[PDB]
Amino acid sequence: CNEYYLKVWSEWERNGTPGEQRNIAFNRLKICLQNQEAELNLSELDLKTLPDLPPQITTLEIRKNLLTHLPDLPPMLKVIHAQFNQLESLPALPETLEELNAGDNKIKELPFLPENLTHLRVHNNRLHILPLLPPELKLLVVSGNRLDSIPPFPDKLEGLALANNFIEQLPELPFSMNRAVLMNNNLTTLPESVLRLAQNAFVNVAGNPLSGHTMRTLQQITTGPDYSGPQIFFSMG
Amino acid sequence: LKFLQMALWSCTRKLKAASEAPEEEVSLPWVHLAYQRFRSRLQNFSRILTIYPQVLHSLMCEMTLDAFAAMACTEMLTRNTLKPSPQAWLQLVKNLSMPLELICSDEHMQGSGSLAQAVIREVRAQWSRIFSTALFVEHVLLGTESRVPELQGLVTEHVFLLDKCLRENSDVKTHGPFEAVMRTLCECKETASKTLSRFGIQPCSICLGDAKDPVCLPCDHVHCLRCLRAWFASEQMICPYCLTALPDEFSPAVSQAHREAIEKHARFRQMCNSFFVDLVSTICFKDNAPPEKEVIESLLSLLFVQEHTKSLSPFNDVVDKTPVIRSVILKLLLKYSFHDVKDYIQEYLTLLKKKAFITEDKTELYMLFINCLEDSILEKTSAYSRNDELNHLEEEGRFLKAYSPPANEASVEYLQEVARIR
Amino acid sequence: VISPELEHLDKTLPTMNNLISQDKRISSNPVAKIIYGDPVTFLPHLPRKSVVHCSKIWSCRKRITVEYLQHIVEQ
Ligand SMILES: [Zn+2]
Ligand SMILES: [Zn+2]
């Protein structure tokens, strides 16, 4: 099948438009074929679309290109760093994807994701709809999108960030959460579980149009340092 | 001289046709009468030929040469758009504006026939398109040349895109052309932002404005120095936007590149805002009739973001920290009769007064309206003659005789009464 | 010498006006109370219900002229 790979890479090379250093891609991609590489790079090549990718790699860098939609995908494409492409939405995603970064893209909605996708980053995208999240989502990042909505948080969401969206209401953070950032959202209030957390979690909620009496509620709670909840901040200059 | 003869000959023939008698003979006196009746039109035609003599080549019982000269000029300006040079073209447009605007006014061309009317209708749509493109040129292109010459190509392309979008229906007082212009300007600003930096331009996630004191990071997203100091207090090593582990030894600083880029983007936004404001003021709010409901509603919507207030601009990228209130749109609407604008102004007042931007002790807000209403009346009265002033003073007397008086608030009628009384 | 002074008129004039209005020769005069103070305090006939029946909506204001534009431009 290697010959078909050589054909498709050289022919997509025939698509050479201005700026697209697909020749350099050809050295790298053929090299990947020759080693059967675990790691590959195509980032910063100003590419706009890709042909079939090698199957045996467990990593692919395509960041800083002009891509808008992607071709067939490896079975074991564990780690993709697709930051700053022009993606609108992505094809069927692989099983063992344990980390994916799609930040700075133009995406609007993503499909089903793995069980062990411990890290996700889609910052600065245009998401509008979030499917259910996995049991082991150690990180969820959705900032920069246009969401005023959010599904429940998974059991294992240690790190969370939500700022720059339009969130008006937030589900509860579990005991595993340790660093929440909720700045400049449209939140109405922050619920009580956020206090029950450990005494070391940073929670920034500034920039939100939160309930002033709810603020004073947290004021009475915070003037009682006897509670070992986290440190909550609502504004800074 | 041949064309002036044809014009004055047609004027004489028309005037004599209206002599209450036939044209049995056409004596010399009628020629003087024609000059007296059509002096301004003929002088204006002469001015046009003087400014753009080329029109003569294009020209090769009713006075029509002026209208066809105007049509020829709008053709020999749409064709020669930006040629020979932007400054010469803009300056020619300017010089022609006064005569072309005269020809396009019902006063200057009272009673002319149907061919002249249809010609003037087309000349109006053409002049609207030319003037809009000229304002875009004057504000965005010329400024871009000096400040951010890198963009002159994009501005030049978008000039022809604007001309192409305004072509069919150039009545910017309607909805479709207005939205098309706003959309084109937004695409142009977006493309300029993508061009001035291949990663684009984004505001800091802390202040959500331009990244004053721009600081980049190993993640390429931009923030501010002061915000990064306030953030780095302790236990807060990682960026907020991405949760990247900053090296323990990290120390921030400013990248000159990004401050230059931001300054260029701000200059560009300022020029585009000036173009939009000029188009609204001069083109949209021009006639002896207010723009349609959709235009005014969109403009009132543009003042506020979903509340926070901002200057008149189609870009949701600048906002006044405090809810500032300003008088522009109010003055524009008040250019017309209060009877027509009452519901728009009362909607604007109820919108501001909806706890969106003011809280209580509103006595200053009402003063703003009253002052503008006072200005509006003064503006109209300064056009009046002496006998108009006397008739006005008598009408106002019988109004003060007719005047006779809910609580806890005021309306635009009450405020207009307060102004008139004052 | 003179120009430094004119810059501060917006404050210096309200100060002088206060010192003058509160002088016994004036502070008990009704016309002065109308011009410099709020008459609602000493005229019970004045309504106090509607926002329009305040003191400021019924106060004077600068008439705009060419001279005032000239001065503003120079400043
Ligand atoms: Zn900031
Ligand atoms: Zn970061």
Residue numbers in the entry:
A (entry chain B): 37 to 273
B (entry chain A): 3784 to 3843, 3854 to 4099, 4112 to 4210, 4217 to 4233
C (entry chain A): 4684 to 4758
Please share text taken word for word from the publication where this structure appeared.
We recently discovered that the initial step of ubiquitin coat formation on cytosol-exposed Salmonella enterica serovar Typhimurium (Salmonella Typhimurium) is catalyzed by the E3 ligase RNF213, which ubiquitylates bacterial lipopolysaccharide (LPS) in the first example of ubiquitylation targeting a nonproteinaceous substrate. Shigella flexneri is an example of a cytosol-dwelling Gram-negative bacterium that has evolved a plethora of mechanisms to avoid clearance by cell-autonomous immunity, including antibacterial autophagy, to establish its replicative niche in the cytosol. These adaptations include the IpaH effector proteins, a family of bacterial E3 ubiquitin ligases that are secreted into the cytosol of infected cells, where they engage the host ubiquitin–proteasome system. IpaH proteins comprise a short unstructured N terminus, a leucine-rich repeat (LRR) mediating substrate recognition, and a C-terminal so-called ‘novel E3 ligase’ (NEL) domain. Lastly, to gain molecular insights into the interaction between IpaH1.4/2.5 and RNF213, we determined the structures of human RNF213 bound to IpaH1.4/2.5 using cryo-EM.
Among all 12 IpaH effectors, only the virulence plasmid-encoded IpaH1.4/2.5 proteins bound human RNF213. Cross-reactivity of IpaH1.4/2.5 toward RNF213 is not unexpected as they are closely related proteins with identical LRRs, the canonical substrate-binding site in IpaH proteins. Unsurprisingly, given the sequence identity of their LRR domains, IpaH1.4/2.5 engage the RING domain of RNF213 in exactly the same way. The cryo-EM maps show that the LRR domains of IpaH1.4/2.5 interact with the RING domain of RNF213, whereas the unstructured N termini and the catalytic NEL domains of IpaH1.4/2.5 remain unresolved. Binding is mediated by the canonical concave substrate-binding side of the LRR, involving an extensive interaction interface spanning from strand β2 to β7. Several hydrophobic interactions (for example, IpaH1.4/2.5 F120 with RNF213 F3992 and IpaH1.4/2.5 V177 with RNF213 L4036) and hydrogen-bonded amino acid pairs (for example, IpaH1.4/2.5 K100 with RNF213 D4013, IpaH1.4/2.5 R215 with RNF213 Q4029 and IpaH1.4/2.5 R157 with RNF213 C4035 carbonyl O) stabilize the interface. We found that in the presence of recombinant ubiquitin and E1 and E2 enzymes, RNF213 is ubiquitylated by IpaH1.4/2.5 but not by their catalytically inactive variants (IpaH1.4/2.5-C368A) or IpaH9.8. We conclude that IpaH1.4 but not IpaH2.5 is required for RNF213 degradation by S. flexneri. To obtain further insight into the differential contribution of IpaH1.4 and IpaH2.5 to RNF213 degradation, we analyzed RNA extracted from cells infected with WT S. flexneri and confirmed that transcripts for both ipaH1.4 and ipaH2.5 were present, indicating that both genes are expressed and that likely a downstream mechanism (for example, lack of IpaH2.5 protein secretion) limits the ability of IpaH2.5 to target RNF213.
